[PDB]
Amino acid sequence: QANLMRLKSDLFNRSPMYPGPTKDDPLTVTLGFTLQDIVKVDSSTNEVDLVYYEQQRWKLNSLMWDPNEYGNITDFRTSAADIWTPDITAYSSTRPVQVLSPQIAVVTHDGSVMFIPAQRLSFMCDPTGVDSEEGVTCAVKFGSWVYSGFEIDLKTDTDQVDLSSYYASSKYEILSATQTRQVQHYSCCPEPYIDVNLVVKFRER
Amino acid sequence: QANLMRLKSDLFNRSPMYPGPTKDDPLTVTLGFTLQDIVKVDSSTNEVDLVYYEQQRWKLNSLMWDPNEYGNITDFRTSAADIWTPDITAYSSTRPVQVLSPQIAVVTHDGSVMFIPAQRLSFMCDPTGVDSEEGVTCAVKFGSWVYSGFEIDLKTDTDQVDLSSYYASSKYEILSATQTRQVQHYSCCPEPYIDVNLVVKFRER
Amino acid sequence: QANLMRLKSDLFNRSPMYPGPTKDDPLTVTLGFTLQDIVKVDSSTNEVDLVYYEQQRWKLNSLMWDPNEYGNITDFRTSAADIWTPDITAYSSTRPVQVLSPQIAVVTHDGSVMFIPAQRLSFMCDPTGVDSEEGVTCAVKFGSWVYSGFEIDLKTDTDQVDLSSYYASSKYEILSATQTRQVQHYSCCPEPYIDVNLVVKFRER
Amino acid sequence: QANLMRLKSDLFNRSPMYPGPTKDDPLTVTLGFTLQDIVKVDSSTNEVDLVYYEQQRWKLNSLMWDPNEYGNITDFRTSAADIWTPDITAYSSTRPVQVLSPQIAVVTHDGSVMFIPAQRLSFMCDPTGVDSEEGVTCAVKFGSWVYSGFEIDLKTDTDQVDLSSYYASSKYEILSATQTRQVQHYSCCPEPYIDVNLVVKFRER
Amino acid sequence: QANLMRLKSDLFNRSPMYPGPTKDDPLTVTLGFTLQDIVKVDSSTNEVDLVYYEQQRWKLNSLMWDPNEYGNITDFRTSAADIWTPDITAYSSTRPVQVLSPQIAVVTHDGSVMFIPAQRLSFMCDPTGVDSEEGVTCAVKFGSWVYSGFEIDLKTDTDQVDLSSYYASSKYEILSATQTRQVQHYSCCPEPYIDVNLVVKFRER
Numbered sequence A, B, C, D, E: 001q002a003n004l005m006r007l008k009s010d011l012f013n014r015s016p017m018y019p020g021p022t023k024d025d026p027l028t029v030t031l032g033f034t035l036q037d038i039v040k041v042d043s044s045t046n047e048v049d050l051v052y053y054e055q056q057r058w059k060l061n062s063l064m065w066d067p068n069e070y071g072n073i074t075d076f077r078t079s080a081a082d083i084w085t086p087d088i089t090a091y092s093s094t095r096p097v098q099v100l101s102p103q104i105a106v107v108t109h110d111g112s113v114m115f116i117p118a119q120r121l122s123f124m125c126d127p128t129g130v131d132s133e134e135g136v137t138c139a140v141k142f143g144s145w146v147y148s149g150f151e152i153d154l155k156t157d158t159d160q161v162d163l164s165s166y167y168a169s170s171k172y173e174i175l176s177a178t179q180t181r182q183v184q185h186y187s188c189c190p191e192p193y194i195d196v197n198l199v200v201k202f203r204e205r
């Protein structure tokens, strides 16, 4: 359709790209995790591998449009390259995250963007006692690597991690999986930094 | 040489790229698998490695042309970068898919496109009992990561996976291989998401 | 160096790139293998690792020039990116080929191009009996992934693989190595596809 | 905000990029290490893997501005690609460094730049005696690969490595971690080269 | 700085890039190796891993300048991408070379260029007898992949490999390390190909 072709150029090729949030014009990114599998556990390096998808959501006034002015188009899909995306990083990874999904995001007329990156992550986790009935607990923090609390804010729609798509025949059972917002102060910086703490209690099936 | 150079310019450099399907202008992608080998089976992580090529076909009105107006050219080969391609993704992969073939597609005057990506896939599968006479059964779903059934529809020309090119001296005998269209409903969204379920039954040779 | 700078500009920057062969403009690519080493044999996955270089050769009328019109220059070296190159692919690889040589080709005034890519290949090969006196035999087909026989034809200057540069202290002895042209018919396509079959009989040193 | 979009334009797109330091216009880069984990130790190759983040800091006159002239903007985040960055390299690495953080730096109105790359490093370290109560000591030098002392100078805000974020359940305890500036002389060059020596004494739990 | 920025524009953005050497305008590249460590020895595949840096040196008339006309600037550092670099390749590698240093070269007013790439190399080497007092000897040839002797010539400033920076606590002692120039003849070509043979005799510590 000719209508959608016009909207994409009337937004991206017509205006310069979003320079990211500022202290004056902050941004709130809504985070959410859907855990798929605990693939590997390396007891000799205390490295644990997770397969999950991360639901990222934010709103930009620069991405708004009137659907009536563009042939009643409410939303559209686009390459994550064509738009600004938050630098949400795992604070205890041991190897670069592996992307398992297409780099496509969906933009809506109200300016809200949704990005659902699937990934394989290796993080610092001591699995001592995973073989027990009680199980072992491990956590990993996610947040911006460069933006403070005054620039990028985080939130979760639920504190419960989505386990509805967890791999039934995994070598590891999930006992609990939690996503909790945290406000931390680091020596580096006078301003606070926000993260979402992914905490999973698991055991050998 | 000169006629083909002109056609490619008029199709890609003159008109804007296809913005993908919409609910109003959907698309049907025909899927098909040609299984080559079951390379590896990791019983400690329940990860199984597949080598296959998936034939994907779709038709675009934006890609039509009159062969008489372009020196009786009926079709041509082009980089998969020069054209829109469907985001068909494996829903239970454990590592990024490895591409084993050139990223070239073949376009025909009727607007039909054919892309046959060869790849190595590691997916979640419990291989317990592969050592038996009966063998073990495993499945993996393929479908769009961002487009719903209202935007991208999937179909198969047959429900029989092409095993004509399966590696005769593989460590694993293929007992059966099936490709079935399935329509799923996810908690995530209020529209159905459709996929192609690849179901293999195999055993040790 | 001024003469060569003019020639390279007048060929590539003056004319649009070669859109690849067609049935009206066919092409014959001469193939040849120089086997260097059989590095690894994985009996649990039936994957064998080769190190070789393949000599690719073709001729383009679009790449012809008068040496007298360009300061008696008969030939020149150029990046494989600056020119069209055939999509010669291994039909039974298990992992993406690893390039071990620079991506440079040599162009001659008659329009003939020579490209000698060195590479490490992992392909489907059952090594059962490599430990015997008789040894084990394995094969791998090479050919275009998208072009038929009426677009790209293949030929060999000899059926005998160059073993003159094979690694003397390899863990595996080559008993024989053959390169044979094959014309194959696939259901997919009304035209015959053509390839070069690399067959190597080898054993433990 | 357009105020920032105009500043990024007037800095980078208006002026040519910084050609790096010279003997006439030198630069001092402030270095600092935050050690996160000692992931593994390979006693058969004497290779040790570290996870840490490097804090890089320098000031450019070409990057300073009056905040009042650009809507009271004191600082901003930007891709490490659109700015010059020092070539600080590990002098005893055994494999290419793996980047674990986004390639974003923060520029301030005074022309001071801060870059905090997180990374996984494999370096030459003999772990003989890591099993003892005394532990083992290892070091790695960091510095410019091309710029000398007269071009790039290095300094540390402290000689103590930040261990505040070290992984509590690591297989290895840190006994001490030091960052010391060194001025060395190499045969290659008549001018002194300067580096920061990362020295860590550790032991297995 | 205003002065260096102008020279970098007048050198690269003014004139077209160097099309490489020809038979009429040859080039002599001076090679030199600084061996850092023998990391690994794989007796089951006869693959040995080296960590070293390779000093490359050549002179181009196209890169000459009058320092007085450019604010008494004698030399400058630049990306290896901005300039032509020789295709010096290891003739017996088993995996792609891993770069361990920044891709920056230093250009001098006389047109002489220096490039010092650090790298990790896996090459064909039978380590049988490394455990003995006598040790084992291994070699690897380095040279152009496309240019003959009549186009690129190689030379060494010394036949002795720099062992001054060899890793003190390496699992392997160097008994001798030699960098000798060789002129050979291959079947492929009527012109002689020239190379530098890196020969290292080593044993277990």
Ligand SMILES: C[N@+]1(C[C@H](O)c2ccccc2)[C@@H]2CC[C@H]1C[C@@H](OC(=O)c1ccccc1)C2
Binding pocket: A091, A092, A143, A144, A145, A146, A147, A186, A188, A189, A193, D036, D055, D106, D114, D116, D165
């Ligand atoms: C969350 N951070 C990492 C944090 O220190 C950390 C590191 C490892 C484990 C747990 C937390 C904090 C802040 C961002 C990110 C990287 C570090 O970043 C910084 O040091 C910083 C960031 C911006 C400007 C100046 C300095 C520290």
Ligand SMILES: C[N@+]1(C[C@H](O)c2ccccc2)[C@@H]2CC[C@H]1C[C@@H](OC(=O)c1ccccc1)C2
Binding pocket: A106, A114, A116, A165, B091, B092, B141, B144, B145, B146, B147, B186, B188, B189, B193
């Ligand atoms: C099928 N999906 C993956 C799902 O997690 C899954 C995993 C394993 C087996 C079967 C389905 C479901 C739906 C499409 C695809 C990607 C995910 O996509 C989404 O959740 C989504 C996509 C677009 C807009 C808003 C949300 C979840």
Ligand SMILES: C[N@+]1(C[C@H](O)c2ccccc2)[C@@H]2CC[C@H]1C[C@@H](OC(=O)c1ccccc1)C2
Binding pocket: B034, B036, B053, B055, B106, B114, B116, B118, B165, C091, C092, C143, C144, C145, C146, C186, C188, C189, C193
């Ligand atoms: C030679 N081909 C691959 C070969 O048959 C093969 C078979 C099994 C596994 C791996 C390679 C054949 C033909 C080209 C190439 C890729 C495949 O291509 C096709 O099926 C095809 C090609 C062009 C248009 C429409 C369909 C099969």
Ligand SMILES: C[N@+]1(C[C@H](O)c2ccccc2)[C@@H]2CC[C@H]1C[C@@H](OC(=O)c1ccccc1)C2
Binding pocket: D091, D092, D144, D145, D146, D147, D186, D188, D189, D193, E036, E106, E114, E116, E165
């Ligand atoms: C520290 N360097 C390496 C050094 O030789 C070394 C190597 C291994 C271990 C420890 C130090 C020194 C100086 C920078 C870096 C690379 C080498 O660089 C050079 O030899 C050089 C640099 C610029 C112009 C001409 C030559 C030597």
Ligand SMILES: C[N@+]1(C[C@H](O)c2ccccc2)[C@@H]2CC[C@H]1C[C@@H](OC(=O)c1ccccc1)C2
Binding pocket: C036, C106, C114, C116, C165, E091, E092, E144, E145, E146, E147, E186, E188, E189, E193
């Ligand atoms: C040294 N070469 C490889 C050589 O055959 C070899 C291969 C393995 C081990 C030792 C030497 C020789 C020459 C360069 C390089 C690549 C090969 O290159 C060629 O065959 C060639 C080069 C230019 C024009 C036409 C053909 C052969």
Ligand SMILES: [Cl-]
Binding pocket: none
């Ligand atoms: Cl693994």
Ligand SMILES: [Cl-]
Binding pocket: none
């Ligand atoms: Cl590992």
Ligand SMILES: [Cl-]
Binding pocket: none
């Ligand atoms: Cl493997």
Ligand SMILES: [Cl-]
Binding pocket: none
């Ligand atoms: Cl290996």
Ligand SMILES: [Cl-]
Binding pocket: none
């Ligand atoms: Cl390793």
Ligand SMILES: [Cl-]
Binding pocket: C169, E124, E125, E126, E138
């Ligand atoms: Cl040998």
